[PDB]
Design a protein around this motif. Sequence first.
Motif, short mmCIF file in Angstrom:
data_model
loop_
_atom_site.label_atom_id
_atom_site.label_comp_id
_atom_site.label_asym_id
_atom_site.label_seq_id
_atom_site.Cartn_x
_atom_site.Cartn_y
_atom_site.Cartn_z
N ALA A 10 0.93 -1.42 0.10
CA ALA A 10 0.11 -0.02 -0.05
C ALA A 10 0.90 1.40 -0.03
O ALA A 10 0.32 2.46 -0.09
N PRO A 104 3.20 -0.16 6.73
CA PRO A 104 4.23 -0.56 7.92
C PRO A 104 3.45 -0.80 9.13
O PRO A 104 3.85 -1.46 10.14
N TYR A 105 2.28 0.04 9.35
CA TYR A 105 1.59 0.03 10.89
C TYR A 105 0.24 -0.74 10.66
O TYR A 105 -0.53 -0.34 11.58
N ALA B 111 -2.22 -0.22 14.16
CA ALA B 111 -1.38 0.13 15.49
C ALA B 111 -1.32 1.48 15.53
O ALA B 111 -0.73 2.18 14.39
N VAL B 112 -1.79 2.50 16.45
CA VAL B 112 -1.28 3.73 16.75
C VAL B 112 -0.43 3.73 18.08
O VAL B 112 -0.82 3.18 19.10
N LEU C 8 -6.11 8.20 10.73
CA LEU C 8 -5.17 7.36 11.02
C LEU C 8 -4.24 7.55 9.67
O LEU C 8 -4.64 7.53 8.78
N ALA C 10 -1.36 4.91 8.27
CA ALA C 10 -0.95 3.75 8.27
C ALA C 10 0.71 3.40 8.14
O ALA C 10 1.08 2.35 8.24
N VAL C 11 1.20 4.52 7.49
CA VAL C 11 2.92 4.48 7.50
C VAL C 11 3.61 4.64 8.95
O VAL C 11 4.37 4.04 9.25
N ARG C 12 2.98 5.74 9.68
CA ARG C 12 3.56 6.18 10.67
C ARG C 12 2.91 5.46 11.94
O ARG C 12 3.41 5.50 13.07
N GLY C 13 1.84 4.83 11.75
CA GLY C 13 1.00 4.42 13.21
C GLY C 13 0.79 5.40 14.24
O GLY C 13 0.98 5.40 15.42
N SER C 14 0.04 6.67 13.55
CA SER C 14 0.11 7.67 14.15
C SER C 14 -1.57 8.31 13.65
O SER C 14 -1.74 8.01 12.64
N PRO C 15 -2.07 9.41 14.54
CA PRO C 15 -3.28 10.18 14.00
C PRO C 15 -2.66 11.17 12.83
O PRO C 15 -1.41 11.21 12.68
N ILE C 98 -16.70 9.79 10.34
CA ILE C 98 -16.36 9.12 9.35
C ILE C 98 -14.83 8.79 9.54
O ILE C 98 -14.14 9.67 10.02
N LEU C 101 -8.47 5.68 7.25
CA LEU C 101 -6.82 5.31 7.24
C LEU C 101 -6.31 5.30 5.92
O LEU C 101 -6.60 4.82 5.12
N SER C 103 -2.84 5.12 3.55
CA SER C 103 -1.37 4.82 2.97
C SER C 103 -1.39 5.59 1.75
O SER C 103 -2.40 6.24 1.01
N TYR C 107 -6.27 3.66 0.66
CA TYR C 107 -7.29 4.10 1.79
C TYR C 107 -8.42 3.45 2.28
O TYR C 107 -9.00 2.83 1.44
N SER C 108 -8.75 3.35 3.44
CA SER C 108 -10.05 2.90 3.65
C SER C 108 -10.80 4.02 4.41
O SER C 108 -10.55 4.94 5.13
N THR C 109 -12.30 3.74 4.52
CA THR C 109 -13.24 4.66 5.15
C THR C 109 -14.31 3.97 5.65
O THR C 109 -14.86 2.97 4.98
N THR C 110 -14.79 4.39 6.95
CA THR C 110 -15.72 3.47 7.84
C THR C 110 -16.44 4.49 8.20
O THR C 110 -15.87 5.63 8.60
N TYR D 105 -20.93 -0.49 5.54
CA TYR D 105 -20.70 0.77 6.17
C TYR D 105 -19.19 1.34 6.01
O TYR D 105 -18.59 1.94 6.68
N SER D 106 -18.42 0.41 5.00
CA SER D 106 -17.06 0.72 4.89
C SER D 106 -16.60 0.35 3.46
O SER D 106 -17.29 -0.52 3.01
N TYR D 107 -15.63 0.94 2.96
CA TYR D 107 -14.85 0.51 1.82
C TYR D 107 -13.38 0.68 1.88
O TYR D 107 -12.91 1.86 2.48
N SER D 108 -12.58 0.09 1.32
CA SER D 108 -11.20 0.43 1.00
C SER D 108 -10.73 0.26 -0.49
O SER D 108 -11.65 -0.30 -1.38
N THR D 109 -9.93 1.21 -0.99
CA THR D 109 -9.54 1.20 -2.30
C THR D 109 -7.95 1.27 -2.47
O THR D 109 -7.53 1.99 -1.74
#
Lengths: 115, 116, 116, 115
Positions: A10, A104-105, B111-112, C8, C10-15, C98, C101, C103, C107-110, D105-109
């Motif tokens: 990703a 990575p995370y 992970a955060v 969030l 996903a590369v840094r594992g941070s907000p 909303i 996450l 990268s 990305y994903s959205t939930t 309620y979710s998706y990723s791309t």
Amino acid sequence: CPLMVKVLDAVRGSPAINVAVHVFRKAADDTWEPFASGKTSESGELHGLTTEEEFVEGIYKVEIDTKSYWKALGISPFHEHAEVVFTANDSGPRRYTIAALLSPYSYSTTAVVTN
Amino acid sequence: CPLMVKVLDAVRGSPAINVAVHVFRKAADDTWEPFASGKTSESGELHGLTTEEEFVEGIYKVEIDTKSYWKALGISPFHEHAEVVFTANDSGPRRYTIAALLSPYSYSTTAVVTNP
Amino acid sequence: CPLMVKVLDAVRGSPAINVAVHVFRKAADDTWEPFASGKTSESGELHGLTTEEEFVEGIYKVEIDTKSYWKALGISPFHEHAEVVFTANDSGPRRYTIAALLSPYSYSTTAVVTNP
Amino acid sequence: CPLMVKVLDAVRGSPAINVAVHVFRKAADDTWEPFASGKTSESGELHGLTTEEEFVEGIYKVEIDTKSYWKALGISPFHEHAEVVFTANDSGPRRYTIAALLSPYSYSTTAVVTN
Ligand SMILES: Nc1cccc2c(S(=O)(=O)O)cccc12
Ligand SMILES: Nc1cccc2c(S(=O)(=O)O)cccc12
């Protein structure tokens, strides 16, 4: 091919190439017994792990060696590995594709169960 | 709180409530020893698993009991559970949130990691 | 707070901090009218976009400025932004989170939708 | 095939079949102009949307009609559609695969950009 694995990166938007994958079957005594392994190809895919005759109903674990992958790209990862644990069934559709998206995370994993 | 877990349900668009969570720590002899366990609350969060003192450096496995959760809702899911394995506190004490998003045939985990 | 966003990295594992967010509402004439905007805080959260009164039923677009965010970190991402489009409050007032996450190539959205 | 779309259903662990996809190119006046469309196949895939000659550098939007998909399966979804917006480049690798994983309620791309 009853069981295939496909891994994407990703960060780079590419197949994850040369990622070691180890598959385990749960034994009667509840330990994990090596079953199959390989490395993803240039297309991020791993085929020919097992055959229909050998892939009996059972609980299986697919371990994706994500830490080594990131390390090789010089990127500090969170997980030791990605770990996909599932029951293989005889009357669900026949082909299992375990897909995994790597960051990575973070990672996600999806099961694609078809004919 | 050094180790927390938050689970969302991607089918309902809600926190995933009453999700069982078991945490293991890899021992010197390379077995997984039981470390902590709990269940997510109505906010989908699990706090108070451990303490700063007990949460030493090591390799931890967070096992999120996704199959039990879906089955209680009449869904037949693919996975037995989600298994999140990581080294913790190798660079000193950190605070970890393990976030998970659950679908019947898919999950993700993020992970955060923050420095208190 | 009826509409909130949490991002969030996903590369840094941070907000994901200082992520710009623009919200639009589909008007009677079918154009996107500007509704609200803001930036995520150091916790990766964005609150106070709107009020219960102003957040009426309609079709909303939440545009998360992911390309600006990655570029400020020296990463060349794939997406221009993440675009989250949904009907809101058609069954009465709800509260929406909303979650996203991020990268560089994914990305994903939930959505977490609760009834206050 | 410069631009492919592949859609998976995370509820059923299957390709998402017969999902309408509309692609748009951003015009000089900043409006979205229809460019290509189709429906995913039995394998959840959509090929032949465009050609290398037509797929010029530009900003593109891929709109995946997720609401209709879920409705057809009797499941109440959150999003109107999934919406993937990106710049198509001449010196990134040549083939773009837009992958999308769908939940109510979710998706990723994910973008997979290769040779
Ligand atoms: N997939 C996800 C994206 C962004 C946030 C998420 C959170 S949290 O922010 O509410 O802790 C929890 C679980 C999944 C998330
Ligand atoms: N081949 C693939 C198609 C659609 C989605 C995929 C994902 S994802 O669900 O995590 O985004 C991961 C790996 C392969 C995918």
